[PDB]
């Protein structure tokens, strides 16, 4: 087994370069699983966009306003679970 030795801050990075998931397992209608930082909450896909980089797709709450139904990223978005990947050390200077 492992334990908990991924607990990094002010960590940097836009586009997933080379994620474990992808949109290829998301189509519309679907199910997806909303991960919040120190919350869980669930939406649901309509529609999906692929101008951006990363792609963005449209999530839309169920018995909820309208208010909620946005769009937004994949960074919020989890195909199933959280994706570890490896990491190095910068240095910096004021």
């Not at 334990?3 to 209608?29: A, E, F, N, Q, T």
């Not at 919040?36 to 792609?55: G, V, Y």
Request: with cysteine.
């Amino acid at each position: 087994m492992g334990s908990s030795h991924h607990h990094h801050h002010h960590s940097s990075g836009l586009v997933p370069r080379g994620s474990h998931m992808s949109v290829d397992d998301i189509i519309i209608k679907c199910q997806c699983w909303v991960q919040k930082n120190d919350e869980e909450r669930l939406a649901e896909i309509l529609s999906i966009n692929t101008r951006k980089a990363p792609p963005k797709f449209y999530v839309h709450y169920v018995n909820y306003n309208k208010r909620l139904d946005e769009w937004i990223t994949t960074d919020r978005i989890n195909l199933d679970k959280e994706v570890l990947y490896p990491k190095l050390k910068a240095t910096d200077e004021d």
